[PDB]
Structure formats: structure tokens, C-alpha cells
Design a protein around this ligand. Structure first.
Ligand SMILES: CC(C)[C@H](C(=O)O)[C@@H](O)C(=O)O
Ligand SMILES: CC(C)[C@H](C(=O)O)[C@@H](O)C(=O)O
Ligand SMILES: [Cl-]
Ligand SMILES: [Cl-]
Ligand SMILES: [Mg+2]
Ligand SMILES: [Mg+2]
Lengths: 363, 363
């Protein structure tokens, strides 16, 4: 029968980049003979506007019915005044990850051939290339530990957060990182702060337990502060990074910016049953919404990753990725990936999606 | 009467860079007429070897008697096998900061004129320069919060750490950052994760309270993940960074590596009474110990910062800083700051300290 995908475009540039993803997906469906049905739901600011909250119960029910979620991005100035709790990102993302038990986040990032000069790294460093998959534990640690809150008053008012991890939680995310490394370059770098945090001591211990089953994968451990330095100096030496929730938030961002090409980057958030949400690493960029200049590649690649990881449609995911590569390598670029003297030749969001969709067809 | 300085050279390159600092200090004492008495104590690995622990009670008593501590660096492979608890860094640094209530850490970092090309940043970014003072809260947050430890067994064995901050703790570190900014470029960027952590919500709240007293200082807040990205893209736009304990550990390291010149960088750790410990940001670098090639500038500048901050000897601190600048600007460089084709002309650790000491004298 039909695959089912819930589409949660969100705010800002979400809807316009989503239209291009839907356009490429349709080419893929025709080429591979796939029956996929789509249903659309509000989330983030458009959900606050139509329903009073950023994650409506009907949107949760709709995601629950689907095999995966193709997600855009949420947030905008319209909602920034609200309490931390009621806002599009915190109010939709954290509840979605807890609700669907999405303990696995994967952010692939590489310098694409021919676009290494976009990196903010010195040219002798960026020309060496890099390709780093960040595996981040997404439903544990300090994001969801209890107790959390505040007590007390005046100068003695105090807040607290609790970072907690169990062996079962660390084992499952570490297995993902070692499995991923087996299909890449067989190296995992686990990022922790084991000279300070009890949680990191246990993290490092359990990752060493898991690593016994993968002797052909090199394991190394690095402290979070040093990691931010070593990603500047030698990013070509890392393959998979394995991080807790807070340290993976930080490392994946630094690596994303090291690409210089964040409009290409996508994010996988998956549970143990293979259900997942797939979305650009970049945000809703409300400053360019509706101008038709946003780079749709991150949203289109989020759809390829949805086909590979949730639907196990490997050839279909490969086809989208090949088509994107063709556009980038043929220099068919949106404006943020061009120099100021070439920027007048930027391709629009629609031109990009048209090229990519045509390439999937042409086979 | 005499000022009193406890000298804790530590392991690896500590003693050799310390000899150069002592050499410059002696020039300064003669030029400014200062009476300073020094006493030496073991800490870190040499203290483990002579006394069985990395922070002997007699070393604590000796620091307590002194007006400030000129500290080297601790750690080495000889001690890496030991339990996390018993090792030179964790065992000496964390106890020293708690013991002496050193809640204020300050790490100044700039691209020095004429050495911008050392940065790992693209040349169009590094040539714009940067000068960023990181103010890091050093005795609170998750480093020292309780409860911390583990319970449970097998797959349900779990560890925990607690991040805690009070209004009094945030106020005092924030005042340092705003005062510092008043004498610099009047901008504080406070780094937090207030979309996730209760402690960051309170941090941001208290920093806004403190900021009312300094309306001529620009305040902005940035999330830790985004900060690691924005330091790559626009480091010339930051002046003072104000961070909690874990986020300041991370941001100061990334900025240090962005200099490309970590052998120049020093660290201030101070209590509310003006007592402090002053040390290189870089480590004991056991791989080059005794080879007489280590760059002593970080240790020598740690002594200038000891004179300015603990002893309020502003002209003496200025003199050391001018003398260092003279060496760097005259191209009198140790090897790690030279290209491979010029590296044969590296100056030794002693040559550096001699030049700098002579410059202080020459006035
Ligand atoms: C919005 C925020 C809660 C979120 C997180 O911290 O995970 C974001 O930074 C991310 O990386 O997806
Ligand atoms: C050694 C470690 C405990 C220490 C810290 O985390 O503060 C170090 O990274 C530092 O920055 O001084
Ligand atoms: Cl965490
Ligand atoms: Cl902290
Ligand atoms: Mg993030
Ligand atoms: Mg550190």
C-alpha cells in the first residue's frame, strides 16, 4: 500500500522550500513507481496563529499516523515576545522529540566539491575537504533531565537543571555512531567532558563497552572545549562524531558553519522504530520569505534522507542526491553561494527545484 | 612591605617558561623599585611524584599566604592512567578554584598585529583583526553543582550532574563583564542556552538586571551553538563575552584557536578579594619539555596580568606587555609562529626571555 508522509512546512521560507521538495519528490515517485500520500499540518508560528499553540494535538495525531515527517522550519519575529515555553522552536521541537522518542539525531555535513572556498577556514585548510557526520543523542541529558526549575528569592533565588544519562540511553546512540562509521571511514570521535561531568564519565565508559563489538572502527575521545579547536585545525581527520544532547547541539553547529554552505545541510531525527522527522539544519530565515531566493537544497535533501532512513528507499534517495550534485557541480547556484561580482546570476528557489526535478526525471 | 607571589610551575614546559617569566619579573622589579618575594611549590604531576597527590596541603597553605599565584601548567602522559579524580588537572584545578573561591576567570585573546595570518580563518576574515575578552564564571554551574554521581546497575545504571546558579553568583560575574566592557569597546555578548536550560533563563534575567546600571554598554544575548558559528563568521564584532562555567570553557577555547597563536595567551582566575592565579591558557606540552623551544610569552604575560589584577601595579604590567609586543613586532618569534621555510630561524625560549627582559630594562 501507500507510504504516508506528514508535511509540516512551518514558518518563513519553510513553505517555499517545501514546494520544491514536493516537486522533486513527485519526479522521484514517477521514476521509481512509488505510491506516497501526503498530508499537511500546521506547526510553529502558523500553528500558534491558527490554533493557539505551536504543536497542536491534531498535528501530533497526524504525525503519529504517518510513516515519517518532512519538516520545514519554525520561528520568526512575530512570536519572539512570548514566554520561552510558548514559542515555535522550543514549544514544537523539544515536545516533538520527547513525544516520538526521537533519540537519534544525525547531521551530515561536507564541503561540496567546487564550493570549498565558501568555508570560513583558511584556504589551505578548506581545500583539503571534510565530511563529518554528527550523531547527537536527542532525548536525554540536560535537555529533559529532572529536577529542573527554580526556587528561592532575591539574591538567593537559584535555578537548576539536571543532566542524566543511563547505560541503555548511551548504548543505543553509540551503536548508531559505530554502525554509521562502518559504512563510512570506520572512525568515531566521542565528544565529552569526562574530566568534569559524571555523565561524561559514564558516557565514555559505555562508548568503550559498545566499541568492543566494532574492533575495526577507530575510537577516540575528545573533550568538548578541545573539539571546538580541533575542528578548526584538522576537520579532514574526523569521520563520525558521537555526542550527548548539549555537546551535539554545539559541535553540529560549529561544523555546519565550517562548511560555509548551510543552505545545503539537512537533519535526521529518528526513533527506534524507524519513524523520523527530516528537516533543514538552517532556520526559517523570515528576512527572505516569499522572495523566492532561499536555497531549497536543504529541504530537498531532507526528503532524500526521509526516503533512505524512514522508508528504506535507497535508490530513490540516491537519485535525489545525484540530481542535487548535478545542479551544484554545473554551477546552478542560489545567491548566497556566489561571490558579490557573480551574485547577479543567482538562481531562484523555483529555478533550483526545476533543475533538480528535471534531473531526477532524465535519470 | 614586600609583595608575596607563590610560584607553581607544574609539569612539562612549565618550569622552562617560568624561568623566563622570573627573568622578566626581575627586570621589572629593578625598573619600578618593587620588593617582591617568591616562594616555590609543587603542584600537578611533580606534586603527585614528591607527595602523592596533585594539590598538597602545604601548597594550598603556601598559596594562602601569598598575594597571588604565578602558575605554569600541569599534566602529562606519566599520570594519564590514574582515576579522573587523582590526576594533575582535574585534581589540582577544580580544587584550587573552589578552595580560593576564584569565581572570576578572564581569558583575553587578540590577533596580534603582523600575526593575523596564523589564524585558521580565511584571510579576508583574519585580516580584519579581533580582540575578544572572555569572562567565564568559574566556581558555579555544572562543575560544582550537587547532586552529582551515579546509581543503579546494568542497563539502568545512570549518572547525573546538576547545573545550579543563583542570582548572587550571576550578578558578580556579570558586573566584571560590564566593568571590563566599559574600559574596552562597551559591548557585552552573554552566551547561554535560555531556550532549554532553567539556569540560562535565570542567567539572561540577571544579566538584564545588571545591564540597567551600564546603559552605555551594548548587551546582546546569543545561544551557545550559534555563538560557535558567529565567532567564525564575524569575530571582529565581539568585545566582551560573558559565559557560565561550561559555556565559557567552550567559547574561550574556540576563540583561542581562532588566534592561531595560543602560545601568547594567558588566563586570570580571581576571587572577590583580588587574590588570583595567572597562568598560560595552553598546557604543559610534555612533547617539547626541556628542548628550550616552547614559547614563554604566555607565561610572561601571565606575570603581567598578576601585576595588574592582583597587585594593582598598572605601569609594571604595561611595561611587560610593551616589551612582549616589541619582540613579536620585531619578528623575534619562536618556531610555532613561523612558516616552515622560515622555521629554521626560530628563537629559543631563553632568547625570547632575554629579549623581553632587556626591553623592560631599556625602558
Ligand atoms: C531550538 C533549540 C531547542 C534546538 C536544540 O537546542 O536542540 C536547536 O538549537 C537545534 O539544534 O535543533
Ligand atoms: C581541565 C579542565 C577541568 C579545565 C576546565 O574544564 O575548566 C580546563 O578545560 C580549563 O579550561 O581550564
Ligand atoms: Cl546533555
Ligand atoms: Cl555551567
Ligand atoms: Mg542547535
Ligand atoms: Mg577548557
Amino acid at each position: 500500500s501507500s507510504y504516508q508522509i506528514a508535511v509540516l512546512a512551518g514558518d518563513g521560507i519553510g513553505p517555499e522550500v517545501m514546494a520544491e521538495a514536493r516537486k522533486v519528490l513527485k519526479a522521484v515517485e514517477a521514476r521509481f513507481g512509488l505510491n506516497i500520500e501526503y498530508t499537511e499540518y500546521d506547526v510553529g508560528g502558523i500553528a500558534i496563529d491558527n490554533h493557539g499553540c505551536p504543536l497542536p494535538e491534531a498535528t501530533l495525531k497526524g504525525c503519529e499516523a504517518a510513516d515519517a515527517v518532512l519538516f520545514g522550519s519554525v520561528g520568526g519575529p512575530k512570536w519572539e515576545h512570548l514566554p520561552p515555553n510558548d514559542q515555535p522552536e522550543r514549544g514544537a521541537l523539544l515536545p516533538l522529540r520527547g513525544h516520538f522518542e526521537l533519540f537519534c539525531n544525525m547531521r551530515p555535513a561536507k564541503l561540496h566539491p567546487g564550493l570549498e572556498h565558501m568555508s570560513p577556514l583558511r584556504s589551505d585548510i578548506s581545500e583539503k575537504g571534510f565530511d563529518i557526520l554528527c550523531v547527537r543523542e536527542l532525548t536525554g541529558g540536560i535537555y529533559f533531565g529532572k529536577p529542573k526549575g527554580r526556587q528561592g528569592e532575591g539574591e538567593n533565588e537559584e535555578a537548576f537543571d539536571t543532566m542524566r544519562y543511563s547505560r541503555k540511553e548511551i548504548r543505543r546512540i553509540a551503536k548508531i555512531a559505530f554502525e554509521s562509521a562502518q559504512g563510512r571511514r570506520k572512525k568515531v570521535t566521542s565528544v565529552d567532558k569526562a574530566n568534569v561531568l559524571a555523565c561524561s564519565v559514564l558516557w565514555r565508559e559505555v562508548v568503550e563497552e559498545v566499541a568492543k563489538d566494532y574492533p575495526d572502527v577507530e575510537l577516540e575521545h575528545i573533550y568538548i572545549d578541545n573539539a571546538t579547536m580541533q575542528l578548526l585545525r584538522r576537520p579532514n581527520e574526523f569521520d563520525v562524531m558521537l555526542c550527548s544532547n548539549l555537546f551535539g547541539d554545539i559541535v553540529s553547529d560549529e561544523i555546519a558553519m565550517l562548511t560555509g554552505s548551510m543552505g545545503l545541510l539537512a537533519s535526521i531525527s529518528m526513533n527506534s522504530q524507524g519513524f523520523g522527522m527530516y528537516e533543514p539544519a538552517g532556520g526559517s530565515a523570515p528576512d527572505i520569505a516569499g522572495q523566492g531566493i532561499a536555497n531549497p537544497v536543504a529541504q530537498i535533501l531532507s526528503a532524500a534522507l526521509l526516503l533512505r532512513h524512514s522508508l528504506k528507499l535507497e535508490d530513490a534517495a540516491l537519485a535525489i542526491e545525484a540530481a542535487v550534485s548535478k545542479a551544484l557541480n554545473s554551477g546552478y547556484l542560489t545567491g548566497e553561494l556566489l561571490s558579490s561580482d557573480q551574485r547577479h546570476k543567482a538562481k531562484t528557489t523555483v529555478q533550483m527545484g526545476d533543475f533538480i526535478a528535471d534531473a531526477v526525471k532524465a535519470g
